[PDB]
Amino acid sequence: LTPKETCDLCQIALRTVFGHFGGNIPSRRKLVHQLKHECKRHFNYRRRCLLLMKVNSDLIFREMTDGSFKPMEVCLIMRECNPHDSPL
């Protein structure tokens, strides 16, 4: 994966799962079951995605449930996006 792809993928994944719950996220355990499912939709990204959500599910949960949600921002904090890259 390019650093671009890797950034884009972070965003696509978090946005898709956030849209899935329509912003009403029930619990971290549940959030995680979907983050994992969503990781497996991407052949080349599965392995990295899965470890990313594992380590950072608390940060993703917090940011998602605050109402802010901007995917590109949480991906910057995880350093899967750098200030260089762009949103979607």
Numbering used by the authors: 1 to 88
Task: Tell me, in the authors' exact words, what the paper reports.
In this study, we investigate the structure and biochemical functions of two SAPLIPs from human (Necator americanus) and dog hookworm (Ancylostoma caninum), Na-SLP-1 and Ac-SLP-1. The structure of both hookworm SAPLIPs were determined in hexagonal space groups, and closely resemble the fold of the Sap domain, as known from saposins and other SAPLIPs. The fold is comprised of a four- or five-helix bundle, where a kink in the third helix can lead to occurrence of two helices, α3 and α4. Three conserved dithioether bonds link helix α1 with the C-terminal end, helices α1 and α5, and helices α2 and α3.
Na-SLP-1, in contrast, is exclusively monomeric (MALS 12970 g/mol; theoretical M = 13530 g/mol). In the crystal structure of Na-SLP-1, the C-terminal extension of about 30 amino acids, which is attached to the N-terminal Sap domain could not be resolved, which agrees with the results from mass spectrometry. The two monomers in the asymmetric unit agree very well in their overall fold as is reflected by the Cα rms deviation of 0.55 Å. Crystal packing analysis of Na-SLP-1 reveals a P2-symmetric dimer, albeit with a moderate interface area (571 Å2). Despite being a monomeric protein in solution, this dimer may possess a functional importance in the membrane-bound state, since it combines the basic surface clusters of the two monomers into one large patch. For Na-SLP-1, we found 14 void volumes with values larger than 5 Å3, the largest ones being 29 Å3, 30 Å3 and 43 Å3, using the same probe radius as in the granulysin study. Intriguingly, Na-SLP-1 and granulysin share the feature of a loosely packed protein core, as evident from void volumes in the interior of both proteins. The function of Na-SLP-1, in contrast, may be similar to granulysin since both seem to share a scissor-like motion of the two “jaws”.
